[PDB]
Design a protein around this ligand. Structure first.
Ligand SMILES: [Pt+2]
Length: 71
């Protein structure tokens, strides 16, 4: 059945996109309408170099919901 949840592959793609602004503050929502994701570096991982961020443990993720997508 369709999951209707964001996928890890897609969240990782977003991480690539916003990597220059990635911080311990929540990122912008990945979408301007519908459902997307926001990500941030976990506060306890702020000291880590970019190349040692573990997806599961060092990155936090939350669903964000914008207004319905228009036709
Ligand atoms: Pt929104």
């Amino acid at each position: 059945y369709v999951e209707f949840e964001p996928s890890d592959k897609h969240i990782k793609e977003y991480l690539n996109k916003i990597q220059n602004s990635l911080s311990t503050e929540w990122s912008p929502c990945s979408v301007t309408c519908g459902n997307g994701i926001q990500v941030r570096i976990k506060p306890g991982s702020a000291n880590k170099p970019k190349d040692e961020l573990d997806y599961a443990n060092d990155i936090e993720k939350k669903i964000c919901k914008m207004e319905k997508c228009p036709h």
